[PDB]
Design a protein around this ligand. Sequence first.
Ligand SMILES: *[C@H](O)[C@H](C[C@@H]1CCNC1=O)NC(=O)[C@H](CC(C)C)NC(=O)OCc1ccccc1
Ligand SMILES: *[C@H](O)[C@H](C[C@@H]1CCNC1=O)NC(=O)[C@H](CC(C)C)NC(=O)OCc1ccccc1
Ligand SMILES: [Cl-]
Ligand SMILES: [Cl-]
Ligand SMILES: [Cl-]
Ligand SMILES: [Cl-]
Ligand SMILES: [Cl-]
Ligand SMILES: [Cl-]
Ligand SMILES: [Mg+2]
Ligand SMILES: [Mg+2]
Lengths: 302, 302
Amino acid sequence: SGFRKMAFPSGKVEGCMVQVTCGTTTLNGLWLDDVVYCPRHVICTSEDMLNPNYEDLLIRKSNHNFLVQAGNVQLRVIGHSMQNCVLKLKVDTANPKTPKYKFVRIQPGQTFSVLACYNGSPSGVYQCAMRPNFTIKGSFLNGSCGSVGFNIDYDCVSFCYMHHMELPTGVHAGTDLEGNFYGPFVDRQTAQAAGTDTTITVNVLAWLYAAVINGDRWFLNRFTTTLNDFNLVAMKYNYEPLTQDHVDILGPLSAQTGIAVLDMCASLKELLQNGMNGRTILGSALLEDEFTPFDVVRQCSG
Amino acid sequence: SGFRKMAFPSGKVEGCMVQVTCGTTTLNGLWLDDVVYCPRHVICTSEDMLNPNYEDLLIRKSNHNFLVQAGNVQLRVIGHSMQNCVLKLKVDTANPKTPKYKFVRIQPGQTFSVLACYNGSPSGVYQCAMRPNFTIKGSFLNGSCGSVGFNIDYDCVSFCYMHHMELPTGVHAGTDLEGNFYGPFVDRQTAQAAGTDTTITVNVLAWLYAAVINGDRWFLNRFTTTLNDFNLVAMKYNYEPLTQDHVDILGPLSAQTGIAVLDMCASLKELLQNGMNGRTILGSALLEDEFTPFDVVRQCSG
Ligand SMILES: *[C@H](O)[C@H](C[C@@H]1CCNC1=O)NC(=O)[C@H](CC(C)C)NC(=O)OCc1ccccc1
Ligand SMILES: *[C@H](O)[C@H](C[C@@H]1CCNC1=O)NC(=O)[C@H](CC(C)C)NC(=O)OCc1ccccc1
Ligand SMILES: [Cl-]
Ligand SMILES: [Cl-]
Ligand SMILES: [Cl-]
Ligand SMILES: [Cl-]
Ligand SMILES: [Cl-]
Ligand SMILES: [Cl-]
Ligand SMILES: [Mg+2]
Ligand SMILES: [Mg+2]
């Protein structure tokens, strides 16, 4: 038993991380088959950061302007192109360590593992959720751009995030592997601000089921509620309304514990209204909304 | 910027995990050079779990009683021996994926990455601290035994934990790679109970410095205190006394922020006495003691 924020083993992704240099600018890239993906701000000139012309800047560059480093070995760049906010660098050598992989765009509330990297070498791995305001709360310094977020099913890697930038509030923004930003942000240093965020109601319920499964049950009541009744409380405490599909994906967790989704909603309701009586749930003194229903089934069934 | 519980990339350890079967009993092993380490309770007969004679049980077993599986490939067992609570299985084939590695015994308060495994295949990675009561708060089910805890420096893996058992309170116990238990526990199903735990004062201070470095500073006061004054408060709130060596290893963090160790102690003091005013520090509503001084320097300096 026990419940901890848990990342996926990063080995299959570590064997795809390379370093990308264009000029003075260095960051990470993702070497899959004969191609290396990295953020397109790797070609920005120092003062042309406020509003860079990426089309103009990219046609200026040869294959020779891009150094692609994979240890103490230089991969050969034989083509430079752009898709949305990601460069693609064709190389003559395919990645012998290439795994079965898809590219996927995830939804707010959904989690992925981040492999934080600097100068091409993996540094640490941690779990993130895409917030409703389309940012993540990660940990990222200068050199971290090109770090990816991913999920693993069987032997297939689902890559869903590439790191680009830090917003004033200390939160992070990036795109999918097609180079499209999550949220309303752009890859220029123009003033941008994370919108107002909300609590991922379905994920809080999932985590309360994780509690019950691990014997943390002090907060369970036997009060009735309804979807409409619960949503009136949700809205008041800055929680997303619970939808019927949200109810449906908590079906597994409801089946295993014998506690109807709406019984757990009446428990979450009393927690919102009365607080936690200076107690913890799974060692947290607040309600955790960064674990999906899937995350709980996966970790409470190995 | 940003601060998250962060594990080490698990790739170098993933390439050492194998499956070990003796009879009906299966669990993980650690294939380094020509040897496979696993917990010695892998040879326990079903009813001989209360007080197993491990010396008697092990001499009963051939090399042929131990199936060692590394994918869809069976490694050849050419010798069975025991060191404390770990079996060692000699194999004819050395691990081609073997990395530069030490075995180390860590101290209470110190952190490591866990690679949770089932039937030899890595499942997830997370960060743990050895508690003062010599348990860890991990996440572990049937089949997880043989999962290891590790640290990485340069290209060298420091393996410091192997998983053995779950205590009644939902907390976990294991040994070092020499097979010696952390804490007063034994690898038999006799009644054992985690002692009383305490808060790792040096790690809370480290994490408060992590806060200040990431701009979370509402809790900083300008009150004076002394080591003796602080320890009187520490003792009252079930914190370990701060020692001069604890003061010394916070030197890096004190240098970088301009805040003397004892100034931060006066801040931790007021937090203990007055609480957190329903606020968070780095997104936690309680004081986190699972990050070492080293963990903070490493993550706030990439
Ligand atoms: C990529 O390595 C780098 C990582 C950032 C900086 C430190 N922590 C991170 O996550 N990305 C950037 O530095 C980014 C570059 C632009 C070309 C996108 N700039 C940035 O993060 O700050 C931009 C900003 C300025 C003013 C308001 C809003 C955003
Ligand atoms: C190894 O795979 C297994 C994993 C445990 C069980 C579920 N979660 C875990 O972490 N280890 C054991 O099952 C262990 C076996 C003994 C031979 C050490 N037994 C156990 O964990 O419970 C023992 C116990 C009983 C009564 C009081 C105190 C401890
Ligand atoms: Cl694809
Ligand atoms: Cl590392
Ligand atoms: Cl994590
Ligand atoms: Cl050694
Ligand atoms: Cl996996
Ligand atoms: Cl973690
Ligand atoms: Mg183009
Ligand atoms: Mg022996």
